[PDB]
Each structure stands twice: as structure tokens, then as C-alpha cells.
Symmetry: D3
Subunit: 303 residues, 6 copies
């Protein structure tokens, strides 16, 4: 039967069938959107990312046969659980709904994909992984986001991992790659190091990418958290707070690919994408491809 072109059809992630978080379904991969962006401190727009990512994903429908002739994502079923129904304001309630939906989706698929949304969504998302022993997080980001309080709130996008670690004793380690910028929260940096978290500045990646990959976890349960601002603004300009000299698509993917080949990937979130800030549309196209390519790697090497 004929297939739709990218501009045709209802935009669901990877053109997957639509389902309800608490519905009677099962799939290898399931996507869930979290259109929440009221926690960021600069330019809004990430609330539109889930829809933009779904639309851009229509250019990356699995499976994929590479130039080398190998096919990946063969026999991997997909489902789109829609978006968490968010209230207006009421961050605490939003968090609870996000965690609940994440729990349900996680219990019906092998690898859940969460589409943000500003980075604060990673906190309630991680709460749905409390039963994962020695849970590790591999985070691509220009920022650490391990802050306690910022602008009189505990729920900003600058505090998701700090909030997660205090709510999840099983979250034993975080590896953050791509840090750069003129300013860092000293209390957050100290608190992270105090917990043994691995901080890898973008300088480390540029100097020796092989060494960075060597610093990644091995044989661990890993949750991926990809903040699009970890990538260079020239590559992905569509984000609220860009920082120059970031990861190339290739570098970020190489890192994800490496971790995926040596660990049990329990989930992934893609946050801070701001479609409205990139009229060329390349930001959502490249990031949608990033998610799909990461899944390729995950299923091409899973235990």
C-alpha cells in the first residue's frame, strides 16, 4: 500500500499507533510527551517541542537500512501514548501527573521515550524509575542542573537532578557531558562531586572524545537525558539558553551510541527543544533523528 510523505498523515511519533497511557497495549518503544515549559528562566517554547518532534519524526520512520546494507530497528514495535494532561500552573500537580503517566508507559514498553518540555520534567519522569537498582543517568547538557534553589523555587529547570537524587536513593550516579559557560552554581557543583557524580566539560570532549567515551558507565542500568543545548547552537539553535562551542550532532550521538552498547538503557528524555526559536526547522529534524538513531543503537546491541 502507498505510504504518506512527511507532510501527510496525523503526526504521531515515528508514525506509530496512538494509545492511552493506561490502555491495554504493549510495544518495544513508546513515546510520551510532556509539553511543560513554565519552569525555564529565559525563552519559552519547549511546550511546543513534543508536537514538533512528532512531526519531524515522520522523516525518520523505522526500520532503517544503512548505506552498508545493514538494517536496524527491524522488528521493533512503536506506540505513541500522547501527552500527559497538564494543568495550568500547579507545578506539584503537574509533577504527579507526569510521574503517573511515565509509570504506566514504562510498564507497557521496553524503552520509553519522553519528549519535553523544559528540563524540569526530568525530575517527575525519573520518579517512575524508583525500582531500578543502582540507576545511572547519562546527561548531555551545557548545564549541570543540580541546583537546590533558583529564583525562589525548588522546581526550576536548573534543579531536576538535585530533586531526583533526593527523592530516589537508587539514583546512585550521574554522568554529565558537555558542560560549558561562564557561570556555574558552586553549591550545585560541590553537591554533585560530593556524591561522586562525573562532570565532563565540553573541553574534555573536544580534547579527547575517546577518553570521554572511556568515562561512560559499563554494565549499568542507564537513563539518558538529552538537553538539546548540549549541542552547539550553530547545529541546534532552537533552545532557550544556548552556549557556544557545544557538541556536534556526531559527537553527541557517538556518546549515546557508546553508552547504549555497554549498558541496559531504561529510558530517554529529550528536553529544551524550542521549535519557535529555529525557523529553519533543522533543530527538530536533527533531534528527532537523534532519538531514532539512539534507539537503533539500543536495540542493535541489547542483552
Amino acid at each position: 500500500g502507498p505510504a504518506h510523505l512527511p507532510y501527510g498523515g496525523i503526526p504521531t511519533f515515528a508514525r506509530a499507533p496512538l494509545v492511552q497511557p493506561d490502555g491495554d497495549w504493549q510495544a518495544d518503544v513508546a513515546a510520551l510527551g510532556v509539553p511543560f515549559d513554565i519552569a525555564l528562566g529565559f525563552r519559552p517554547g519547549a511546550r511546543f517541542a513534543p508536537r514538533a518532534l512528532r512531526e519531524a519524526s515522520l522523516r525518520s520512520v523505522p526500520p532503517f537500512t544503512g548505506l552498508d546494507g545493514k538494517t536496524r530497528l527491524q522488528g521493533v514495535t512503536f506506540a505513541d501514548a500522547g501527552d500527559v494532561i497538564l494543568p495550568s500552573l500547579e507545578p506539584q500537580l503537574a509533577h504527579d501527573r507526569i510521574t503517573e503517566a511515565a509509570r504506566q508507559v514504562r510498564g507497557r514498553c521496553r524503552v520509553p521515550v519522553f519528549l519535553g518540555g523544559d528540563h524540569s520534567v526530568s525530575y517527575p519522569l525519573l520518579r517512575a524509575f524508583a525500582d531500578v537498582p543502582d540507576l545511572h543517568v547519562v546527561q548531555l547538557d551545557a548545564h549541570l542542573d543540580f541546583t537546590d534553589t533558583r529564583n525562589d523555587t525548588k522546581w526550576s529547570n536548573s534543579s531536576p537532578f538535585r530533586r531526583a537524587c533526593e527523592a530516589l536513593p537508587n539514583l546512585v550516579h550521574i554522568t554529565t557531558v558537555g558542560l560549558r559557560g561562564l557561570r556555574f552554581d558552586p553549591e550545585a557543583v560541590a553537591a554533585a562531586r560530593a556524591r561522586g557524580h562525573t562532570i565532563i566539560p565540553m573541553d574534555d570532549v573536544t580534547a579527547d572524545l575517546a577518553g570521554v567515551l572511556a568515562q561512560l558507565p559499563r554494565g549499568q542500568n542507564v537513563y539518558f537525558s538529552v538537553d538539546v543545548d548540549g549541542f552547539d547552537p550553530a547545529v541546534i539553535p532552537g533552545t532557550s539558553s544556548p552556549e557556544p562551542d557545544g557538541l556536534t550532532y556526531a559527537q553527541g550521538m557517538k556518546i549515546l551510541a557508546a553508552a547504549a552498547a555497554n549498558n541496559t538503557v531504561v529510558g530517554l528524555d529529550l528536553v529544551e527543544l524550542a521549535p519557535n526559536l529555529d525557523p529553519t526547522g533543522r533543530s527538530e529534524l536533527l533531534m528527532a533523528r537523534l532519538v531514532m538513531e539512539t534507539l537503533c543503537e539500543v536495540f542493535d546491541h541489547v542483552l
Copy 2:
């Protein structure tokens, strides 16, 4: 329970359930998108209209309780049959697929709603109504679109009604409102008048709206065709070929409301919306509402 905000959830028309054109379903209203825009002669973009209209319709989910406290479209069911699976190029094939999908959708609902796409789609769309006795078309448009041949083709968006008439002996009358501009195809104008069509220049709408409403069909089977460029460019700038001094949203709606109150409406199409040409987004927001409001009027006078 909780309801999605406009920016949340998968965008299906009016948040209706997704169905297959020839699937086992039935509803009062069914939407079908036709993301086809390679027939226009100027600025492309209408291929993205169905999707933009679905997204915009999330701000107009039925039913509607107005300022007067009365509700419209209460109990009226909706379905979104997706988009016609179009080929690349191959206009003839695209036409056949459009007619077939339109037929199947028509037989499963009371009022089908077609989202273009450039105006050329009205031709294959109308072929699905070849069985309607004394079929009348009420067309809102700045242009006549009754041209025989243009730029060496019979399938341009300037010929849909000419192609429709020579193919449908049951299409006995066309009422076109909003015509304006410096250039008009003399052959098309003569041909239209010769077939007994009613041509109402925008000047006449401005001079006396009440008079124009009296020129509309009465007690006939009517198919609505709304070219967004019939509306003033200041109101709806998102379109390929705008013409100054057009219909206000109110005037166009008054015409549709009047016609819907005195005839049996068999279908409606909304064509030529170009989301990419209006960065303010008002064009799609207003046209999604126009479709929903027209439906309110149609179901208010159902016999």
C-alpha cells in the same frame, strides 16, 4: 477528568478519533485532509494546511456553549479520516485517490469536511458527489477558478470548477462570492455566465450584504467551497495569491450561515491556506474556527 490545553495531545481535527476512510465507522462529521499544493502557480505551502488546521482546531473542540448560554453541536459526533495518501507528482493518480477517499468518507458521515491543499483539489472532491441531484456549489473566493487551460495544464488550481462542471452534469449551479482583482480570464467568465452561474463581486458584498444573502440558493443541495483568499489579506494573510479588500471573517461567516439555514449542506472544503505565509498564526486559527462555526450553523438547521 482533566482536559488537554491547545498545545497538548495529538492533533486530529476537533480532537476526534482517527479512522480509515474505508474503515468500519460512522459519525455526523468526518474530516479528510488533502495535502496537495503542486497545482498552484505562485507560493507553495498549502500542503501543510491540513495539519495546521488540525492543530488550530484544538482551540475549537465541540460542542460550544455561547455567550447566550445555549449550546451548539451537542451530541454531534466527529471523526478524522486522516489524509489522502498522495503520490509525488502524478496529478491524475492524486485525483483518483482523492475522489475514492472522499467517496468512502461521504458514505460514512452526514457532513464531510475536506482540508486542502490548493484549490485544484475541489475537482476530484466534487466527483464524489456526482449522484447529488441539482447540486449547487457556494464558493467563497477572490478568483473565479473556471479557467479551461492555464500554463499548459488542465489541472491547475484555476480550473477546478471548470473540470468539475464538464465532468458532473448534476452540478447545475455555482454561486461565487468575493471576486475581485485586476485580471480575470475572459474565456472563463463568459463560460461561467453561459452555464447560468451566479457571480457576486466583493463590491456587491460591500454595497449591500443583505442583498447578497438574498442571491444565495434556497432549498437546494449545497456543497461549500471556501478559498481562504476570499477573505481580506489583513484578516487572513496566509495564502498564495492575496487580493486587497476582501471579506471580513464576519461577512464570510454570514454568507455561510445564511446558506446553511436555507439549504441541505452535503459537504465543505477549506482550501488555499498557507500557514508558512503567516508567522502570526492567525490565519489557521481563524479558518479552523470558521469550519467549526460553519458546522454549528449547519447542524442548527438540519432537516
Copy 3:
């Protein structure tokens, strides 16, 4: 001496001197910004409105000598009290800071001008007018915004006046002009009416403007709340939720001028402007002028 062009100098409202809300100063008019937009339910951007309005106001620096040769606002002093320092999230805290800043600014000027920010800011702003006997509000808006709860919160931009009335027993009446749209909260409309509020649909403005002006308050203490979406989207497209067929600039100005001529104006807010949604920049340019022209009218008939 030489004067800056609109593109030169630091942007302060009406190019007025910068002051602190609780500083030692006095002026006839004082502007205060509230860059808060996390309570709206659709498209963000109003957090940038205060800044855009300041930049745009440089095109409207007082006093003004009209075509007739007369001068308005001669000798009327201005001050820009900057913006309320808002936290991230924490709506209740934001509300408290807004009310405190408003009180301070009110106590140091004759007419305070508040630049939003989504419409939810009108609630904390009004709390600063608790000592105004029989306070009346003249509201220009496409929406009523008198809803109790919406999307599980009491602080959305759809509830500012409901929250205001319950917090301020002195707020005895609201006149809302410009209402239109397919959907209204029946409870909100009925409650407003049951409280004696005056609802004037845009249809009435169109049908008989004189009749509308006749419904405006007389000899009352009036606070002006101008929601830019009250204006037609063709005129002011830069707003989150546009509704077709709205107020022209002239009509809205006639309404404000009429009220300013017969009442004691205690303050004015300009909300819901979304600069990011109008790349032509006409929305902020026209709205900044509206504020300045409104002040011209106010000071022309002050007692």
C-alpha cells in the same frame, strides 16, 4: 539639545527617568512592568511585552502637539519604576510581589500604568487598590476572564477578575467590552451578570457605538484593563488567543476616551501583548501609542 531617535538610548517607558518602586520620587504617571506569562493556556510571549512596549513607546514620547496645534500632556511628569522582580514558578509569591510593587508605585504617582504580562496579573495589581471606594473596572477584552477554576488552577489568566472581586469587596462593578468567540464559561457569564456586571459583546459595539459609550460608568473611580486581544487580530495579531472581528484601534480608543472624560481614572494595565507573535512589530507600536493616547485623554479631563 539633540534628541535620540527611536532606536537610540536605553528603553524606558516614554523615555522617562528610571526609579525604584519604593524610592524617594513623585510623578504624575509611573510605569511598572510585570513580565509574567506562565498562567496563559496557549502561546507564551507576553513576558517580553513590557520590554517591547518600552521600546515602542520611544516612538511616542510626550508631550504631544496635534495637527490642530494644541498640546497634550504638557508638564505631565513620567517615571519608569522598572519591573516587579518575579521568581520562577511560585505564582502566589509572584502575586505578592506584584501587589507590593503596585502599592508602592501607586503611592508615588497619580496614574500608574502596568505593563503585562498575561491577564492573570490584573488580579495582584488590583489588590493594590483596596482603598478605592466603589472601584469600577472598564475592561477591553475578547474574553470575560471571570472563571472560578480552569485547568485545575485558580490563578489562570481566565480568572483574574473573579479572584479580584473575592479579594476586594470594594470592586463593585466591571464593564467588559469586546466579547466574542464560540465558547464562553456559562458559570462565569451568569455569575458576572448576577453580580450586576455589564457585558458588552463586540456585536453591540459594531451595531451601535453610541449606545455602548452610554453604558460606560460616570463619575466613578475607574481602573482600565486593556487586553490587546480585544482588538481585531488584523490590527493587533501579536497575542496568544486571537478572536476575529474585534475592535479597531479607533473604536477601543473612543471607548477609553469616553470613560476617561467622565470618570476619575485610578490606573491602567495593558496585558496579553505577545511581541514574538508579530514580526511586523505593529502590535507593540500601536499598543504603546494606545497607552500614551489614553493618558492624553485622562489628563485632559482630570478633576
Copy 4:
């Protein structure tokens, strides 16, 4: 044979042949661009107007057969003399080249069309009409532009007609229609009235259009100067300094149409268009049409 679509071919005004200002040629209508915008005091962009107007004119290639079957501009020949070769800065030099080019094109056609450029170009342009006895100017503008000095210069866009009158004793009268705004130069207004110029505020057009048309010249030599900001910003947003409540396209055309039919038109300029400020592209499309329609009126009443 086959004709180019609007997006095809080299963009020359009305798709007329290209020629040199001082070349060997003759034509009824000749276009000359003046990409000069360093004299305006706000937002740049008019330097690109000539090009945008040329591109937009491809939508309006003469002749035109209206809905009445009657054809206009039949037999009228067109030519495009390109643009004046302007230096960087050096306004005095730019003016001299503008006048010289204007003189050369004037002597080679019946009706020259000048594409600005900011309004200051009207001055050196008018200097080319020194030999026209009792020259009258019909100016559509939101501003008077009869200022002596502004921001320490005599050459701004606010002084073209002031400069033109003091350099051309044959320029006996000016009728300005569409004036509006909060500020007017009292010295400029007084100076204009002193010379007996006619000032028609936009309110007069709104209150009584017939009274306006009755004030236009009859049987005079007329030069048309159309500042696009005379039109409502909702209709033509692409301009540096928009002012609310202006001329609708139809109103502006009615004025130009009346003057065109009752006088000997010796020239016309279209200034202040800023394509970069209207991403919908409707500003250039509508203004290119205005020029062509004005020409239809001019040659439709030739003696």
C-alpha cells in the same frame, strides 16, 4: 507562446524590458528605482523595496481584462530603467544622481514611475519636474513631511516637500490625504497652510469621502506621491513607522482614481515600503498592484 509564472524570470517591473536611464528608447510607462533609505529615522528596509516591488509586479503584468470584459492598458508600452546608482552616504550626491536619472527617464516616457526608497527621495525626484507649469502634488501619507529641520539635518524623510517647494517655484500646490498620529510639527503645518497647501486628515476621509474627492485638483498637472504608510498598518504593515486607522486599499485607490481621471498625471512615486517588515509579503503584492491599477486609471482617461 508560454508565459512565465510569478516565480519565474528576471524580475523587472511589470516584466517590461530592461533599459538604461540615458539609453536609446521610448515607452508610455517607465519605471526607475531609488534604493535609498538612510534618511528615515526608525526602521530601515525601504532600500529593498524597488526589488520587492518588481518581484511583486509579476503578479500584475499588463494589460488587464476585468470582470466586465473591458480591457485596460491595451497597447501601453512599459520599460524598466533599473535603479539610480547611489553612493554610500553622501546624500547630496545621491540627490543629484536621482534628479539626473529622473530627468532622463522623464524625457523618454509619458508617465515615469519611481520606486523608493524612503520619502526623502521625493525631493530630488521632483526637481526633475521643474518645467511643469502649476505643478500639483497629490500625496497619500500619514505624515505631512513638510518639516524644515529634523535631527540636525535638512535631508530627512520628514522634509522632502519642504525642500522641493523651496527649490521649485512651479510646484504651486500640494494636497495631502490620510494625515493622522499623535504628533505633528507645528512649524511644518503652519508653513504648509501659509503656502495654501491642502491638508486632509484621515478623519475627513472616514467622515466624508465625497467631501475629500471634491477637494482634489481638476484639470491640473499632477504628480502622485504615495507613502505606503498612508494605508492602514493592518493592510500594509511593511513600513518603518505605521500609524493606526489608515486608508483601506480601496479608499486610497478611490482617491488616486479620481485624481487620475480628472488631471494630467506627469509622474508617480511609491515610497516607504519595507518588505523586510512584512514576512507575509502582502505589503509589496498590494502596493505593486496599486501602482498598476493607478496606471490603468491614468491611461483610461487620456486626452
Copy 5:
């Protein structure tokens, strides 16, 4: 004498004199535009590329004297034959129109430059080179475009070279550089390899550029086909289907320079530029320079 600034004058490629494809002229270089984009399967806009490239080329008017003092293209004459007059739809007719214009232009210049247009134009363009013995094509592209059928058509932008080869036995080899992405048509890859085509993935360019250059043809008749999406989207975002990690301008230019210095260049096309997808305008500016710089390289080694 005085010369136009980039925003001045009629935009012709390299500001060259305008000529007709079948006119009496002869130049070393001749540009021909093909504003055709209905064959691509995603985002349209390439029909505007020829015009955008012409305008952008005004920034690179030959000849060019570098920092070293050496001048290039000195004495090399240019001509702009306008654009192929295309019909609406009717791809077959369009193909014929294109081949004919290409034949005419090829016979009047030494090196013809074709401006696309989506990549499907390369096929009818190549048909004009049937008499070139052992024709080789050096293709810069992220995609292979050697597909047989896609979305039910043989004429999409994914099939130009497949169509060219089956119609031109003299087209004995293709070298494609820059390939990348998750998906490749296995049937197309196998068909290209069976014909002995050289496939050079972007990976090899990044791994060893020297080696890639050593793989380029030598002493052959070469036709250059530059798909802008061969370049990294960060550099050239203006294109329908971008793929991350592509050629820098420098790398792509180094490839073209090497091939131009060791072969007899018979022509070149520049396709898939989408000006509407890059509001910064760098895409057209850099791609116009690419054509001019490639020409510098070409004529520096002409025998």
C-alpha cells in the same frame, strides 16, 4: 564608473547582461534558472532559489582579486539566459522545456551554470549532454538520488541520476561525495555499484580528505551537480531535507577545486536551495559564492 551596491539594480547572475536562451549571444559562462520544485517530497521553496541566487551573486561580481594580488575570471564574460518557462504540473512537458533551454544555452557558452530547482531538474539538464563522450558526474549530495521509483513516480528528486543513466549511455560514471543519513535505498545503492559508480560517504571525507580527492576523476569530461544539502545544515540550513554532520563550505569547495583542476568541466547545476527556509539569508549568499568560486577554479585550468 560608479557601481551598484548589492541591493541596487536588476538581479542577474553575477550582474551579467540579460539574454535569451535562443538569442544572438556568446559568453564564457551562461546562467540558466529552473524554478521547479514540485518533485521533492518534503518542504517546497526551491522554485525561489534561482531568484535568490541571482540576488546573492551581486555580492560576488567577477572578476576577483584575492589577498595575494592574483586576479581570477579576468576577461571571462558572463550572461544570464533567464529561466526556463515552465508549465504548471505537466512534469514531462517541463522536462522537455528544460532540456531544450539547456541545449540552446550550452551551445552559446563554454561553461553553463544551471540554478535549481529541486534535484529532479538534473535529469532533463543532463539530457542536453548526450554528445559528451564518456561523461562523468561529480555529485555533492547527502543522498544518492539513484532510486527507480518513489511515492509512485519515476520523476521525483530521488531519481534524477537513475533517469539520466537509463537515457544517456554516454554517462558512464558518477562519483557522489557527502552521503550520510539513517536510510538508503538498497536497490538504488546496488544499481549504482553495478554500474561501477563511486560512492563516497561523508565519513570518508572526515576520515581522509586527501584520499577522497585522489578518488575524483582525472582527464575526463565532468558535469558538476551540487545539492546544497551535501553541506552541513549549520552552514546551509536552507534546504528541504537536511542531514547533520555534512561538508563545510571549505571541504565542498576543495572537492570542486580539485576536480575542476584535473578535468574538462562541461557544466554545473546548483540544486535544492530553499531560501524560504533560511531567514538569515546565509544559505543563498554562500551558495552563490560557491558557484562563482568554482568558476574561478574552472577557468584557472582551461585548455
Copy 6:
């Protein structure tokens, strides 16, 4: 107490207090804007750079505590002297206005930061340093800008350093880094080499950055002139005339940091930024950070 988010408050550079150039104040660093862009020869917009840079700097408010926990700019005071009041046109008067304001600011701070404005402003800015012995200029630029005459004027942005050298014999040397492009003014290049200026093409930076840094001055009075187009267009697209393959943010900064470490920095200007040409906003965000980071470097090596 609480601090403003980036979108909050009046936008002054580094959120520093506003002062008058000749007022009674003193600060370590002082900013002065020069909103002048009528001298460039292509795309306008730089007149808005000073405002965009100030707004963007709110994301880089000092002091800065880095990842290492060390703090820079601690105790270093800032001030914003506003903008030079410029006339319309009248370049010579503007030049004088600029030089005087610059001198006044210089006498009240240690390191002045000048925000352009097209590159021509560097000339009048440098005249303010006529009292500095053996003044050296380190210029980051894609162009040499040492041209005598261009487009019949001596004041274009292509002549600033040429104008400065002939007016300031104390300016004994200029080191330009990042030069690239197809065209260079042989006259300008010769005049520069004659005076012994050091010319470093971008190729040199790419080939051996360490070698470039060894060519920078030591123990000299240095003025930094940073033209944003010296950076790669992919990184900083917001500029009038971009050139492919330029400096990465890191490279440009490495050069600035090296010169600041062993030289007495007397000032710095940031020119040619065009906010209107980069809708993603990254251009102003990155260049504002560049200015701030450069100051960190400067005050880290004060004698």
C-alpha cells in the same frame, strides 16, 4: 534580595547603572552604544545591535564563578553611559558626537566597551585615543577595512581603520585576524602592508593558531575591534555580509584572551551585529557573552 531573570528589568549593559557620559561617575568598565548603520553597503540592522547586546548581556551579568569555583570580575564595577545622540544622516556631525562621547566615557572608566553600529564607527571611536602612545589595534574581521574610497565616500564601513590611521599617527600598528573572501582591495592591502600592519588570513588560524597567537603584541596599549563577521556565519549569522569558514567562538576568544593576558587593554568595540538577520537570537547572545568573557580575561591580568 531576589534578582531579575533575563526578561526582567530595564536592559542596561551587564545590568549596570545608567549614567551620562559627562556625568559625575566612575566605574572600572563603562559601556557606550553607537546605533549608527547608514555607512554599510548591504543589509542594515546594526543600528539595533546596541539594544540587542544590552538585552543579551542580562544573561551574562558579572561577577562570574566558573566550573573550577574561581570567580572573575569580582568587585569590578560597571556602568552604562547610554548611546551617543546621533543626527539623521550628517555623518561628519555623527563622527564628532561619537568622538566626544567616547572621550568623556574614557575619562571616567578604566576599560570602555563600545557597542556598534556598522564598522565605520571604529574611526570616530579611535579618535578618542589620540593621546595613547604607540596605540596598537587587534582587529577580528573577515575584511581588512583599510579602504580609502568606496562607492564615492570616505566614511563607509570599509574605511574605518584607514581613516583612523591618517588621523592618528600614534596608531602605529594593526593586527587583523580572520581575513577571508574572494575579493580584496589591492590598494587597501598595499597601504596596510606599507605601514607594516600584520595581515592574518583565517587559513593561518586554521593551519596553526599557536603561530597566530605568537604574532600578537606584547606589553603594548591595545584596542580590540571585534567585527562579528570575523566569526563563522554558522555561529554568528546575524551580520550584513557573512563569509564562510570563519572563526569559531572558541578561536576568536582564544585570540582575545591571549592579547589581554600581556597587554594594556585600552578599549574594545563590537560591531556589525545585525539582530534582525538572526531570528534564533544566538548571534546577540554569543556576542554579548564574548564581550563579558573578554573583560574577565582583561581583569585577570591587570598590572
